[PDB]
Design an enzyme around this catalytic site. Structure first.
Site, PDB file in Angstrom:
ATOM      1  N   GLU A  11       0.782  -1.236   0.000  1.00 13.56           N
ATOM      2  CA  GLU A  11       0.000   0.000   0.000  1.00 13.56           C
ATOM      3  C   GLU A  11       0.813   1.286   0.000  1.00 13.56           C
ATOM      4  OE1 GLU A  11      -2.995  -0.045  -0.457  1.00 13.56           O
ATOM      5  OE2 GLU A  11      -3.681  -2.088   0.040  1.00 13.56           O
ATOM      6  N   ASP A  20      -6.591   6.272  -5.080  1.00 15.53           N
ATOM      7  CA  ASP A  20      -6.058   4.933  -5.209  1.00 15.53           C
ATOM      8  C   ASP A  20      -6.060   4.464  -6.695  1.00 15.53           C
ATOM      9  OD1 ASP A  20      -8.598   3.959  -5.633  1.00 15.53           O
ATOM     10  OD2 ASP A  20      -8.786   2.788  -3.881  1.00 15.53           O
TER      11      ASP A  20
END
Ligand SMILES: [Cl-]
Ligand SMILES: [Cl-]
Length: 162
Positions: A11, A20
């Site tokens: 991440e 994202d």
């Protein structure tokens, strides 16, 4: 290596609101804020999650606190899910980490949808589950991360992360 270091590699860490891979507003270590297109709706969720007026920026300690909560939640969602729990109970420590990683990324409902792959994991048919897991939008959209998780299921080691 452990679940935290694994997800931190997958991440990354960002201290300002960002979008994202799917274009959603996120912050910290993969903490999804909202699916809404509105940056304001994102700052509102962020302030509510942190407990202060942030203006879209958080500290490293605040990011790690959201991360600790999100890992805990992923584990608890697996344990409460009738489809996930039995798979989880069946796996060794390393593979358990891989399932947590998938749940963290796509949510419990998403993962519980991989009915066939789950059955293959429970049966310990590693090579077959790895082939099946790759026939997915997940694999096609985030192939590097998916390959790393899939290799973890296939081998039961942290090699893909070292
Ligand atoms: Cl939250
Ligand atoms: Cl990727």
């Amino acid at each position: 290596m452990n679940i935290f270091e694994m997800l931190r590699i997958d991440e990354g860490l960002r201290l300002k609101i960002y979008k994202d891979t799917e274009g959603y507003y996120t912050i910290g270590i993969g903490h999804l804020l909202t699916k809404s297109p509105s940056l304001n709706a994102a700052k509102t969720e962020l302030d509510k999650a942190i407990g202060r007026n942030t203006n879209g920026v958080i500290t490293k300690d605040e990011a790690e606190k959201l991360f600790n909560q999100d890992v805990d939640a992923a584990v608890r969602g697996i344990l409460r899910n009738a489809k996930l729990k039995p798979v989880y109970d069946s796996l060794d420590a390393v593979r358990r980490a891989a399932l947590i990683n998938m749940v963290f990324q796509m949510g419990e409902t998403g993962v519980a949808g991989f009915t066939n792959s789950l059955r293959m994991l429970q049966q310990k048919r590693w090579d077959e589950a790895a082939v099946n897991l790759a026939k997915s939008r997940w694999y096609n959209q985030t192939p590097n991360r998916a390959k790393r998780v899939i290799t973890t299921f296939r081998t039961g080691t942290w090699d893909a992360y070292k």
